[PDB]
Amino acid sequence: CVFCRLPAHDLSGRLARLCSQQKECGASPDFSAFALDEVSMNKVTEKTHRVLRVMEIKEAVSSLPSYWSWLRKTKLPEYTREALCPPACRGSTTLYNCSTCKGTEVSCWPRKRCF
Ligand SMILES: *[C@@H]1O[C@H](CO[C@@H]2O[C@@H](C)[C@@H](O)[C@@H](O)[C@@H]2O)[C@@H](O[C@@H]2O[C@H](CO)[C@@H](O[C@@H]3O[C@H](CO)[C@@H](O)[C@H](O)[C@@H]3O)[C@H](O)[C@H]2NC(C)=O)[C@H](O)[C@H]1NC(C)=O
């Protein structure tokens, strides 16, 4: 979900450059199961920018697979609920596919499922 917005962070090139400096590298994982609203896509990209900066300063990639797994299993599900529930969602929202970056307008969830 981190390759669709804020391209000036150059996450792809930064991952490649950190990996030119050692244990194997995995970029990038498949997030095709997810689709996020604009706000959540910015948030997860900014968070990944900050995480990658910490790794760059100390030249350490060993925790990257765990970060991707945490996104897949824990954080991206949280952002998905944020995007579809109040107070963020009213009526409908556009979710952007994490693999293709293409958007689809969908309805918000009912308060029953949200809370
Ligand atoms: C994000 O988008 C990917 C890309 O697939 C898209 O498919 C159409 C919606 C097009 O409009 C394109 O924009 C794009 O290529 C979605 O991945 C795809 O998921 C479908 C599962 O729904 C897979 O389609 C299949 O159809 C036949 C079965 O009839 C077989 O290929 C499979 O059994 C499967 O059902 C398709 O293979 C898959 N594509 C890839 C490359 O994974 C993805 O679902 C979507 N994610 C979200 C969250 O919306």
Numbering used by the authors: 17 to 37, 42 to 135
Cite, word for word, the article reporting this structure.
To understand how TMEM95 binds eggs, we determined a crystal structure of the TMEM95 ectodomain to 1.5 Å resolution using multiwavelength anomalous X-ray diffraction. TMEM95 adopts an elongated rod shape, comprised of an N-terminal α-helical bundle (residues 17 to 110) and a C-terminal β-hairpin region (residues 111 to 135). The helical bundle of TMEM95 has three helices (α1, α3, and α4) and a coil (loop 2) that are arranged in an anti-parallel manner (α1-loop 2 and α3-α4). TMEM95 has three unique disulfide bonds: C35-C45 between α1 and loop 2, and C105-C134 and C109-C128 adjacent to the β-hairpin. TMEM95 shows homology to the N terminus of IZUMO1 (14, 15) with a Cα root-mean-square deviation of 7.2 Å and to the N terminus of SPACA6 (17). Unlike IZUMO1 and SPACA6, TMEM95 does not have an immunoglobulin-like domain at the C terminus. A conserved N-linked glycan in the β-hairpin of TMEM95 could cause a clash if TMEM95 were to make a contact similar to that of IZUMO1 with JUNO. We found that the area surrounding the N-glycan is variable, while the opposite side harbors a conserved, positively charged surface. When incubated with hamster eggs, the R70A, R73A, and R70A R73A TMEM95-Fc variants showed drastically reduced egg-binding activities compared to the wild-type. Our data suggest that the identified evolutionarily conserved, positively charged surface of TMEM95 may function as a receptor-binding site.
TMEM95 is a type I single-pass transmembrane protein. Tmem95 encodes a sperm acrosomal membrane protein, which relocalizes to the equatorial segment of the sperm head where membrane fusion with the egg takes place. Tmem95 knockout murine sperm, which have normal expression and localization of IZUMO1, can bind to, but do not fuse with, eggs.
